[PDB]
């Protein structure tokens, strides 16, 4: 994947982990504004290997790592649908689940018939059992280093998002933690792009000078 702005001479490719440093505060703030307004503004463009423009729905933009909720309605919907598909891939297990649900429905139905008030019921479904169990991704995060790892896991799980972008998220992590994040990104194959106001020492990054010239580092 490649990103192209009118400040760069040629579009730079983003593969696996990428660190982009902008030495101009105006170009950095205007670049983040172009990231949030990407749907509205046509200045900032992104061209994949197919050389096709991507909608803002396919771009994942995350600034605050701790403030980003891992559990969402769409994420829980895709997770519950995935578990329902996994249970549907095995006929015998789903048959046993239907038998147990039939037994529980028979017991609760007998208890309802024992009551003096009329009771009407419909049925119980596997999706209602998963939602009743509260299946969700683990919400326990001790530090931002683990939370960013969970963000990388959920990002690699989501097929619709072709790119993940972090804005000034490298200031919290230590150099060694940055090395572990880069190695985990190279192992996960996902495309991650970082935007930092200042350069980081010890790691390979693309430095954008105030002259607008882009130069590689390390």
């Amino acid at each position: 994947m490649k990103i192209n702005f009118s400040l760069l001479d040629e579009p730079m490719e983003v593969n696996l982990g990428t660190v982009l440093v902008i030495e101009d505060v105006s170009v950095f703030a205007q670049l983040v504004k172009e990231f949030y307004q990407y749907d509205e503004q046509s200045n900032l463009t992104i061209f994949d290997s197919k050389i096709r423009s991507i909608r803002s729905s396919e771009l994942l933009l995350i600034t605050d790592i701790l403030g980003y909720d891992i559990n969402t309605s769409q994420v829980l919907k895709l997770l519950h649908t995935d578990i329902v598909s996994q249970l549907n891939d095995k006929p015998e297990v789903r048959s046993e689940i239907d038998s147990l649900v039939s037994l529980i429905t028979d017991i609760i139905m007998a208890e309802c018939i024992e009551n003096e008030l009329d009771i009407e019921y419909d049925e119980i479904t596997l999706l209602e059992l998963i939602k009743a169990l509260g299946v969700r991704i683990e919400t326990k995060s001790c530090t931002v280093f683990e939370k960013i790892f969970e963000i990388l896991q959920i990002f690699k799980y989501l097929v619709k998002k072709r790119i993940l972008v972090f804005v000034n998220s490298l200031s919290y992590f230590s150099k060694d933690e940055i090395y572990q994040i880069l190695e985990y990104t190279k192992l996960s194959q996902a495309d991650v792009l970082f935007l930092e106001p200042r350069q980081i020492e010890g790691i390979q990054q693309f430095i954008l000078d105030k002259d607008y010239i882009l130069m590689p580092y390390n």
Partner: protein, 287 residues
């Protein structure tokens, strides 16, 4: 090219699909290379690529690089503009002092005659009559220095007796600026001809790369002197803009009305052809 492109703003320049690509955070614009004659960079914050410089050298487009003060610093000179240059070097080495002094004397006579025409259009009878007397008194080897006297009387008559060419005032600064631009265009034309620019047609002792282009650009100085005389009260910025308006304005050649670049190109071509053919015809430019 017909178009002089001036970039005073910070931006990045690239070459894509025979097209000059101007990329800046506010907007991006593409300008074809075939329409572009001269490229001028007036600031130090502009970025360019060596591939676009190679495409500019192949397109034979003059590239000028200025300083932070916006005054021109250094221009790009291509090594080989055409294959006829290597064959023209032998002719330049075979030139004769009689043809050089004759063509240079005729050119100086055209410059002094243009100054007398400028003072005549300015309705000065004594000044243009004296400059015309110096034009009729010009001789080979210039023993009387009637050209320098014509310049001293010209500037002293136009700008006042207290004025001088050695002053640091914005008038002499604009004069040196226009002489630097016209010297850059004439030098680029000499590079198109292929002959050595360092070899002058007047004094063989003086060694300068701009000598020949200055000798070819001597008759056109009064065109800059006119706008410099009209805008002298205006600020140096407005005087520089009026100096940039000379490229948009057209002048009347003996044949017809043409642009300044075409008149300089055809004039330099007739000068080189006259030097190789030993004074067949001398091109004359009048205001």
């Amino acid at each position: 090219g017909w178009r002089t492109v001036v970039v005073n703003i910070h931006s990045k320049l690239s070459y894509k699909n025979n097209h000059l690509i101007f990329r800046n955070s506010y907007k991006t614009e593409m300008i074809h290379l075939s329409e572009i004659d001269i490229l001028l960079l007036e600031t130090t914050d502009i970025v360019l690529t060596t591939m676009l410089v190679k495409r500019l050298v192949d397109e034979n487009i003059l590239v000028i690089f200025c300083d932070d003060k916006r005054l021109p610093t250094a221009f790009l000179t291509p090594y080989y503009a055409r294959h006829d240059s290597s064959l023209q070097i032998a002719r330049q080495i075979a030139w004769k002092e009689n043809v050089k002094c004759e063509v240079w004397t005729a050119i100086i006579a055209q410059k002094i005659l243009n100054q007398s025409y400028y003072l005549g259009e300015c309705s000065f009878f004594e000044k243009s009559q004296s400059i015309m007397e110096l034009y009729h008194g010009l001789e080979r080897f210039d023993p009387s220095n009637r050209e320098g006297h014509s310049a001293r009387i010209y500037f002293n008559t136009l700008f006042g007796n207290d004025f001088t060419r050695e002053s640091d005032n914005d008038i002499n600064a604009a004069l040196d600026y226009g002489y630097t631009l016209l010297l850059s265009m004439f030098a680029r034309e000499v590079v198109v001809c292929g002959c050595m620019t360092q070899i002058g047609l007047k004094h063989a002792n003086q060694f300068n790369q701009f000598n020949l282009a200055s000798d070819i650009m001597e008759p056109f100085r009064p065109i800059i002197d006119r706008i410099v005389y009209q805008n002298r009260h205006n600020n140096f910025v407005k005087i520089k803009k009026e100096l940039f308006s000379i490229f948009s304005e057209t002048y009347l050649y003996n044949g017809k009305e043409m642009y300044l670049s075409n008149i300089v190109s055809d004039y330099t071509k007739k000068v080189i052809k006259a030097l190789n053919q030993l004074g067949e015809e001398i091109p004359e430019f009048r205001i």
